[PDB]
Write an enzyme that holds these catalytic residues in place. Structure first.
Site, PDB file in Angstrom:
ATOM      1  CD1 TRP A   1     -22.581 -46.979 -30.038  1.00  0.00           C
ATOM      2  CD2 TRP A   1     -20.973 -47.000 -28.433  1.00  0.00           C
ATOM      3  NE1 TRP A   1     -22.806 -45.916 -29.195  1.00  0.00           N
ATOM      4  CE2 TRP A   1     -21.849 -45.901 -28.210  1.00  0.00           C
ATOM      5  CE3 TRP A   1     -19.870 -47.184 -27.557  1.00  0.00           C
ATOM      6  CZ2 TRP A   1     -21.670 -45.009 -27.142  1.00  0.00           C
ATOM      7  CZ3 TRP A   1     -19.694 -46.272 -26.496  1.00  0.00           C
ATOM      8  CH2 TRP A   1     -20.600 -45.209 -26.297  1.00  0.00           C
TER       9      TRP A   1
ATOM     10  NE  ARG B   1     -18.472 -39.975 -21.138  1.00  0.00           N
ATOM     11  CZ  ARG B   1     -18.812 -40.098 -19.851  1.00  0.00           C
ATOM     12  NH1 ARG B   1     -18.129 -40.861 -19.000  1.00  0.00           N
ATOM     13  NH2 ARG B   1     -19.851 -39.405 -19.390  1.00  0.00           N
TER      14      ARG B   1
ATOM     15  CG  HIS C   1     -17.425 -35.222 -21.627  1.00  0.00           C
ATOM     16  ND1 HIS C   1     -18.368 -35.555 -20.676  1.00  0.00           N
ATOM     17  CD2 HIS C   1     -17.903 -35.674 -22.812  1.00  0.00           C
ATOM     18  CE1 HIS C   1     -19.351 -36.223 -21.254  1.00  0.00           C
ATOM     19  NE2 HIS C   1     -19.089 -36.317 -22.548  1.00  0.00           N
TER      20      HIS C   1
END
Ligand code: HEM
Length: 296
Positions: free
Chosen positions: A193, A50, A54
């Site tokens: 998820w 992540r 980002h």
């Protein structure tokens, strides 16, 4: 004055070659294996992926601002972006590695962290190029360039146009949501998820297609899609099977993990390299060996 797109030329760290960067990969990969307790034994792999996304996702192709080149996440304005809540844990993981290898630039370290995490979680090899150069604090992009989760397929498609990504690239990149989970205190969403939280597979697409999803309110008053198995999808995730063009690609990756791995490798490298001009005499991309391939 006319706004021309800035040119950011990659410059290899002075006197460094493949073996120097493989040493940094190995240090990251060994710490991934040893600091295994983080986030209820998920480990740091997902948050490093992540982080790499980002620091790259701030790019705007129209004026070549943002992107991974300048390593500007190290500065307070970008570090404190509400959209970056939770990434401080990834930064703190990498800080000792930067102290052991002070010559590597911040953008190279942050992007390499994501490549190492993907490979060490048994994902595809991702070719990686060095030469990002730290730029000063006034080059930090304003907050607000990263995407919102409470949106639909049209928003996703037009957001990713700004990063020069097409439909296949978008669907491939989103498969990284196999990894990790949402945290209520970071983003206002809660839950994983899927089941195999720290192994890189095509599970995200399988769960999209095979679970029974229901739209529910969570404890932060946001709505998310929940399944009886205990998985969740963000509104932008579920948009991938509402839109008929995205749905066709979701089905492709659900049925062929090898195709997913190939397309993800290309799109993730492209994401990490957007905005950077590599000179003609620049070294070819590196393919790093995993710890397993080295017997470590
Ligand atoms: C429309 C685009 C996207 C949206 C709206 C989105 C949104 C989110 C949100 C809200 C979280 C939860 C953060 C938290 O609560 O800790 C998250 C987690 C994550 N995202 Fe995405 N994301 C998008 C695209 C991507 C892409 C392109 C990648 C990488 C290629 C990615 C990789 C990850 C990973 C690995 C996590 C889990 C991090 C952890 O477990 O700490 N995301 N995303």
């Amino acid at each position: 004055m006319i706004t021309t797109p800035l040119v950011h030329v990659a410059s290899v760290e002075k006197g460094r070659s493949y073996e120097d960067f493989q040493k940094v990969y190995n240090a990251i990969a060994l710490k991934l294996r040893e600091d295994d307790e983080y986030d209820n034994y998920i480990g740091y792999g997902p948050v490093l992926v992540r982080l790499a996304w980002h620091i790259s996702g701030t790019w705007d192709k129209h004026d070549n601002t943002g992107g991974s080149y300048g390593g500007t996440y190290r500065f307070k304005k970008e570090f404190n972006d509400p959209s970056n809540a939770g990434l401080q844990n990834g930064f703190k993981f990498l800080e000792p590695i930067h102290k052991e290898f002070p010559w590597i630039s911040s953008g190279d370290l942050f992007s390499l962290g994501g490549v190492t995490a993907v490979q060490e979680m048994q994902g595809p090899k991702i070719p990686w190029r060095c030469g990002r150069v730290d730029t000063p604090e006034d080059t930090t992009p304003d907050n607000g360039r990263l995407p919102d989760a409470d949106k639909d397929a049209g928003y996703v498609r037009t957001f990713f146009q700004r990063l020069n990504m097409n439909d296949r690239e978008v669907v491939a990149l989103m498969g990284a949501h196999a990894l990790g989970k949402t945290h209520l205190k970071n983003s206002g969403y809660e839950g994983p998820w899927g089941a195999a939280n720290n192994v890189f597979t095509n599970e995200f697409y399988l769960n999209l297609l095979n679970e029974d999803w229901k739209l529910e309110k969570n404890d932060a008053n946001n709505e998310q899609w929940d399944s009886k198995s205990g998985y969740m999808m963000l509104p932008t995730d579920y948009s991938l099977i509402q839109d008929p063009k995205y749905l066709s690609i979701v089905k492709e990756y659900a049925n062929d993990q090898d195709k997913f791995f190939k397309d993800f490798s290309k799109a993730f490298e492209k994401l990490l390299e957007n905005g950077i001009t590599f000179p003609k005499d620049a070294p070819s991309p590196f393919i790093f060996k995993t710890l397993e391939e080295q017997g470590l």
